[PDB]
């Protein structure tokens, strides 16, 4: 019940689509700049108490970092960022989807942090024991609001079955509460900045609709302000 260190800030997921529609006129690059600034803030304020992991989804999940302490250094991250180039603009729009990143994100949140492992080392069979609440941040170019709603459904069913699998596993944990941050980017000028609607006892969901540019970084900053928590 120690909700302090076990806040959603302790677990941060970044999912950005490297699908070629995010290279419309390097748009993903801009999203990278904003998300990298958020990741800067988290490590600087909370050197080892707020943790961040990053995922890219060019038709498949490409995870660039782990919960471990060594990965939580921005230079190590930047090497992996430079490794992924720009999405091929002539490549198949089919098969490319952020869903791989979201499913991998659920798997990453099920994974334990080193501090959570220390808590397991001390604790033993206590009620209201250590919880596993986390936050997911997705940045993408969305097509329809129904697209976003189906993504919410996918995440919910993924969490349900993944917790079913992880409950019997005693080297990974179930998720008490996830938080979902949905971010859509239109460059020129449909998603609605839909209010928070926590869809399940485990699931929490949020929707936003904002254009490109660091007003998104400021909105991120407002989120980080809630996320100092």
């Amino acid at each position: 019940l120690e909700m302090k260190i076990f806040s959603e800030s302790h677990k941060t997921v970044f999912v950005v689509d490297h699908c070629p529609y995010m290279a419309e006129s390097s748009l993903w690059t801009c999203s990278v700049e904003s998300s990298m600034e958020y990741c800067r803030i988290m490590y600087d304020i909370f050197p080892f108490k707020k943790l961040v992991n990053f995922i890219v989804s060019d038709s498949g999940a490409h995870v660039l970092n782990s919960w471990t302490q060594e990965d939580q250094n921005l230079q190590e991250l930047m090497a992996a960022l430079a490794a992924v180039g720009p999405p091929n603009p002539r490549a198949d729009p089919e098969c490319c989807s952020i869903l791989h990143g979201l499913v991998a994100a659920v798997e990453t949140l099920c994974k334990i942090t080193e501090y959570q492992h220390e808590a397991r080392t001390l604790l033993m069979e206590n009620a209201e024991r250590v919880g596993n609440r986390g936050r997911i941040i997705c940045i993408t170019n969305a097509k329809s609001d129904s697209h976003v709603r189906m993504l919410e459904d996918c995440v919910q069913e993924t969490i349900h079955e993944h917790n079913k699998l992880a409950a019997n596993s005693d080297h990974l944990m179930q998720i008490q509460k996830c938080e979902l941050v949905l971010i859509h980017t239109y460059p020129v000028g449909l998603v609605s900045d839909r209010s928070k609607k926590e869809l399940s006892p485990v699931l929490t969901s949020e929707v936003h609709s904002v254009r490109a540019g660091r007003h998104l970084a400021t909105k991120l900053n407002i989120l980080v302000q809630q996320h100092f928590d």
């Binding site: 189906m150 996918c154 993924t158 079955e161």
Partner: peptide, 23 residues
């Protein structure tokens, strides 16, 4: 495990469902 294949099923499932908006 026996049901991680259901994780892959979910991923694929919603991947096909995504095409309607993708197209």
């Amino acid at each position: 495990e026996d049901r991680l294949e259901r994780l892959q099923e979910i991923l694929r499932k919603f991947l096909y469902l995504e095409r309607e908006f993708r197209q």
